[PDB]
Amino acid sequence: PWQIPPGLTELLQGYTVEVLRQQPPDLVEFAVEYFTRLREARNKEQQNAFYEILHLPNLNEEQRNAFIQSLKDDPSQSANLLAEAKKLNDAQA
Amino acid sequence: IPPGLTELLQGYTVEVLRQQPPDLVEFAVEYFTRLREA
């Protein structure tokens, strides 16, 4: 459509706040820097979830699959899914 | 607010609305890199 992306404000907000802290001399160069590192952090954070869930010992095969399936489909809630998979795992001990 | 920050973030914002990329962060790396190259 032509909509306003959810999270656009928060995402722009955080770049600005970090601009404050370091006062980079070139806003463009820092943006390339900020968002690259913000990307890498997310890839890093997602990779890790996948595995942990991978070998969580008290999950049956069907649960591990559901969580991993949700994880591959939606990186943004990797923290949400890792939490839910650990809660359901701890209870299943 | 440092000078230029508003115009810079506005520019990115218009293109986000123009193009509706599926990931804002990934597009950000895309958008600002092209801007740096120019």
Numbering used by the authors:
A (entry chain B): 2 to 94
B (entry chain A): 5 to 42
Which lines from the publication concern this structure?
To design amino acid sequences that can stabilize the alpha helical structure of the fusion sites, we superimposed one or two turns of terminal alpha helices of connecting proteins using a molecular graphics program. Then, the amino acid residues important for forming a fused helical structure were chosen from the two natural sequences in the superimposed region. Our method does not require complicated computer calculations for the design process and can be used for the assembly of artificial protein complexes with predictable and rigid structures.
As a control, we produced a fusion protein of PKA_RIIα and protein A by the end-to-end fusion of the connecting helices. Asymmetric unit of the crystal has four fusion proteins. Structure of one of them is disordered at the fusion site and the protein A domain is not visible in the electron density map. Therefore, overall structure of the fusion protein cannot be predicted with high confidence.
